[PDB]
Amino acid sequence: AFSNQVIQRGASGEDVIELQSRLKYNGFYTGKVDGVFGWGTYWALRNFQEKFGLPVDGLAGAKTKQMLVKATK
């Protein structure tokens, strides 16, 4: 359900809601799902990238999104 746009710090809206929710389901995102990409989302996403063997950068491009979808199955 992700768009084709890279999700990164400062973003807001539907892609961020889904990103935070998937990271929460996987145990990485602890805060309130608010749809705003700040420190808590950056931290959770980098920890997800590290755990899943992706380059650790805190930006969700195609490969990170695909891994997050696969990991939430």
UniProtKB/Swiss-Prot annotation:
Location relative to the cell: Forespore
Domain of life where this protein originates: Bacteria
Family according to the record: Belongs to the SleB family.
General function of this protein: Probable N-acetylmuramyl-L-alanine amidase. Required for spore cortex hydrolysis during germination. May form a complex with some hydrophobic spore component, leading to a stabilization of the enzyme in a spore-bound form.
Record's protein name: Spore cortex-lytic enzyme
Part of the whole protein covered: 32 to 104 of 259
